[PDB]
């Protein structure tokens, strides 16, 4: 159905995302259990890590387009990522390595992420009808890899330990690299302009130097989240000032703030919703016992099933509005499950968390899948930078919000933790509902501005 390089890119993306989500699914539990962080420390540290992973995505598109070429930067990103996963596995012998190892993953992700999609765009003549379907299959590739990793990595970490889990993340990257190298002949005439000139060693060294610098800066920021907060605060107010100085951009700004709220909520899946499943949900569904950390896999699960359907099935601001209503309902469902449908021992049915994740995933499919594509329809490089800055800020804010559900390690009674989750999730849902209503009200004016 698709060009031959499509299948190469599909499987490279699948394996890279498997490595990444293998780490993400276990990281907060690893912080708590292996490093002895309180839940509060673990949540803010995950927030900082996630902020760096997402804010640095801006670098790899520039490196691939203008310095080294898309294909070279795919290889380099994959190699830096694999090194990061093996360093994380090594951090169990050498605990002091952990932050450097996470910085290496963040920077590796930054170099890699934009480039396969860019590559995929170049596999099709410019107005090929199959493009939409190919990109929906690309998103499904991401979520198949994520589904496998979030399902299996907690089980593997429980049975064989974290070193094995992280080494298998690294191995997934190695095999992404092997399938790329094996399929290299399929993309010989596919690439950005630097891909076809001999590699500039000057620029390669600049990229390696900057990467190493960034790895150390990332390590420091994750170790000292209290200064990452002000770094992003002052960057945010400053770039806000310079955005205001310089009206389709105003629409881009309001959609950016709405996206920020969405990402604050999305950030709860590996933290507060993860520990809610651990502490206050039954660990049994359809008669099978499961690791509750695996409940995170319900997000890619619902995306994999729902992306074709919704591909089969207003315009921009209303799709954003719908996503915000879905997210609101996910958190109100969580609160309701805890407030009214718990057992006398304080435990709730996992079908409520299945429903929570359905809502949240529909929110993802309406918003983040369809955001910067027509933020690119309203617009440049400055707004991309501000975009990535705001989404990083959203993840830091999300770690902070998650700390309101943090449970001290000595608590053992689910009836003590359930009202904490329900209060926070109910308030998140109410605030998000209010935000969704104000977006609804702004939909017509916004839709005029888009003209």
């Amino acid at each position, epitope marked *: 159905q698709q060009p031959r390089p499509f299948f190469m890119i599909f499987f490279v993306e699948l394996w890279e995302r498997f490595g990444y989500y293998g780490v993400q699914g276990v990281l907060a539990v690893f912080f708590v259990k292996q490093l002895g962080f309180s839940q509060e420390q673990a949540f803010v540290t995950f927030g900082a890590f996630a902020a760096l992973v997402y804010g640095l995505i801006s670098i790899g598109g520039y490196v691939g387009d203008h310095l080294l070429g898309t294909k070279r930067t795919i290889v380099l990103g994959a190699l830096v990522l694999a090194i990061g996963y093996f360093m994380t596995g090594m951090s169990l012998l050498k605990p002091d390595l952990i932050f450097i190892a996470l910085g290496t993953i963040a920077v590796g992700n930054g170099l890699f992420k934009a480039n396969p999609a860019s590559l995929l765009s170049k596999c099709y003549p410019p107005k090929d009808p199959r493009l939409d379907g190919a990109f929906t299959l690309f998103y499904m590739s991401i979520n198949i890899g994520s589904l496998i990793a979030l399902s299996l990595a907690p089980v593997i970490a429980d049975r064989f330990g974290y070193s094995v889990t992280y080494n298998l993340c690294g191995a997934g990257l190695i095999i992404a690299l092997l399938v790329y190298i094996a399929c290299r002949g399929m993309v010989k005439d596919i690439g950005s302009e630097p891909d076809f000139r001999p590699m500039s060693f000057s620029k390669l060294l600049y990229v390696l130097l900057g990467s190493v610098v960034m790895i150390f800066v990332c390590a420091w920021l994750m170790h000292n989240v209290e200064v990452a907060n002000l770094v992003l605060i002052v960057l945010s107010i400053v770039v806000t000032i310079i955005f205001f100085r310089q009206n389709k951009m105003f629409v881009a700004f309001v959609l950016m703030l709405e996206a920020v709220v969405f990402y604050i909520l999305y950030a709860q899946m590996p933290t507060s919703l993860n520990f809610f499943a*651990i*502490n206050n949900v039954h660990h049994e569904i359809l008669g099978f*016992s499961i690791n509750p950390v695996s409940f995170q896999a319900l997000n890619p699960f619902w995306v994999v099933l729902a992306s074709p359907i919704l591909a089969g099935i207003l315009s921009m601001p209303m799709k954003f509005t719908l996503g915000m209503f879905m997210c609101s309902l996910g958190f109100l469902t969580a609160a309701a499950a805890g407030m009214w449908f718990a057992d006398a*021992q304080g*435990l709730t049915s996992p079908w409520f968390i299945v429903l929570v994740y359905l809502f949240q995933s529909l929110g993802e499919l309406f918003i983040s899948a369809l955001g910067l594509a027509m933020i690119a329809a309203l617009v440049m490089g400055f707004i991309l930078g501000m975009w990535f800055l705001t989404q990083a800020a959203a993840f830091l804010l999300g770690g902070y919000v998650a700390t309101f559900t943090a449970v001290p*390690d*000595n608590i*053992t009674d689910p009836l003590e933790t359930l009202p904490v989750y329900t209060n926070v999730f109910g308030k998140i849902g109410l605030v998000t509902l209010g935000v969704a209503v104000v977006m609804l009200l702004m939909v017509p004016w916004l839709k005029r501005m888009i003209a």
Partner: nanobody
Amino acid sequence: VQLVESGGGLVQAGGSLRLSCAASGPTLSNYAVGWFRQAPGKEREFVAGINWSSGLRYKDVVKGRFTVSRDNVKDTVYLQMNSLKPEDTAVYYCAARFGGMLPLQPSGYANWGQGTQVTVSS
């Protein structure tokens, strides 16, 4: 996922016994381990437990007499039972639930030992 209990037996009132729980494939370190007991003609009831990060929970009638503790090198959980009384006679079970919570009812725990008889004679 399968726990092996050891250390039950017969003892006189005022004596002591220690039960131990070990898991096979999964490291017990990630699990809250609760001890339940079933006396003749009644339901399994929560006795005592330790979560994955040293938090403790106890039934009122065993406080000041039973101690739950954990040896994370040997991957084992212990119930040290002192000042035993006839009404402590029961089959004792260890149960394991992933994480930090020790729910009071058997349905909160997925993994179960086979049970060890404890008898306390007057």
